[PDB]
Amino acid sequence: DQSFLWNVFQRVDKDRSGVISDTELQQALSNGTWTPFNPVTVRSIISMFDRENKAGVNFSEFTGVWKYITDWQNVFRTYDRDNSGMIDKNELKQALSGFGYRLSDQFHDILIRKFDRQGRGQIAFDDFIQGCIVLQRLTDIFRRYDTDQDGWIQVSYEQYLSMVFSIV
Amino acid sequence: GPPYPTYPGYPGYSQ
Ligand code: NA
Ligand SMILES: [Zn+2]
Ligand SMILES: [Zn+2]
Ligand SMILES: [Zn+2]
Ligand SMILES: [Zn+2]
Numbered sequence A: 001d002q003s004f005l006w007n008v009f010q011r012v013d014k015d016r017s018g019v020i021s022d023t024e025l026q027q028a029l030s031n032g033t034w035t036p037f038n039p040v041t042v043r044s045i046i047s048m049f050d051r052e053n054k055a056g057v058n059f060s061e062f063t064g065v066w067k068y069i070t071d072w073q074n075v076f077r078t079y080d081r082d083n084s085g086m087i088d089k090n091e092l093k094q095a096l097s098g099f100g101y102r103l104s105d106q107f108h109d110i111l112i113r114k115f116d117r118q119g120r121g122q123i124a125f126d127d128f129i130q131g132c133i134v135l136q137r138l139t140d141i142f143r144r145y146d147t148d149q150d151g152w153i154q155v156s157y158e159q160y161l162s163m164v165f166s167i168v
Numbered sequence B: 001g002p003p004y005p006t007y008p009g010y011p012g013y014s015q
Helices: A002-012 A022-028 A039-049 A059-079 A089-099 A105-115 A125-143 A157-165
Strands: none
Touching: A002 A022, A002 A059, A022 A039, A039 A059, A039 A125, A059 A089, A059 A125, A089 A105, A089 A125, A105 A125
């Protein structure tokens, strides 16, 4: 239904540039609350789908964007089983586990603390995508060294530094 | 296997 998406695109593409910018995409997105969708999350979604390095998405790339956001709303709902419109510690544990991450209980606390911009120990839709993208990024860094894929790496000092230089 | 997904367990693992 590219026809629907094209109408969506046009509405979102406010300045009619033919490309959706970060500030245009943000206005179009809801995190379920009355705060603007996390601008860092917005910029990561643009980066993930922009193929032309233009700080924006054209129509074709927006179709990827729409599918990605929609796939995340569905996951966010699947795991928000108590219909708060926020994901909780227990719900996060079910989510990440469902995703195939094996992580200690106290680590889930570090994740909440790092990503919950609301401050109630519950994760909003925009912050949930964000934390999942960081995990994804960090894991890609890791699995470049986890050769026999057993979740242990042995790295030299210089390998470590370049790992971190490509995060921060 | 690893303590992390190695196949498309969340959106968009291949993106
Ligand atoms: Na290993
Ligand atoms: Zn535009
Ligand atoms: Zn909830
Ligand atoms: Zn809850
Ligand atoms: Zn090993």
